[PDB]
Amino acid sequence: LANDEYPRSWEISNSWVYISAICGVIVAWIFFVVSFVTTSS
């Protein structure tokens, strides 16, 4: 089997928890960068 012939991550119920984590982390990271540059010490 080739590399692009396996089932995708969004099709296996187990990976659902692991994609959500990654997705949440990335969104939080974007907010952190903005909030970092727009705050004053």
Binding site: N14, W16, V17, S20, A21, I26, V27, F31, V37, S40
Partner: protein, 113 residues
């Protein structure tokens, strides 16, 4: 009696494909993660950790927007890589975003800090 008669049939015996967890437990854990992220954002905003006080104004503002666009932009690129976009198109979009994005981000950081 060999070499002459009919031989019995043979059938391959296949292995077992891995079992997948039932959907409700995965859904519960996704809800847990969503609640956790909502907690993070509300925690940041409630505390003065993030207070949006040093907002750029004037010409610096546009540099700020360019920095923001470069940051979100790369993320979007990666997401489209996650959806099925090739690696060559990904490298080309990354170069096209990274030249002027780098210029604008360096100017913003050099002028606001």
């Amino acid at each position: 009696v060999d070499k002459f008669g009919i031989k019995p049939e043979i059938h391959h015996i296949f292995h077992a494909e891995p079992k997948r967890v039932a959907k409700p437990i995965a859904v519960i854990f996704v809800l847990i993660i969503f609640i956790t992220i909502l907690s993070l954002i509300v925690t940041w905003l409630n505390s003065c950790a993030a207070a949006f006080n040093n907002i750029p104004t004037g010409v610096t503002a546009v540099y700020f927007l360019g920095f923001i666009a470069t940051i979100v932009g790369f993320e979007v690129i990666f997401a489209r890589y996650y959806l099925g976009t090739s690696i060559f198109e990904t490298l080309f979009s990354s170069l096209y975003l990274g030249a002027p994005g780098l210029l604008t981000s360096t100017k913003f950081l050099r002028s606001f800090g």
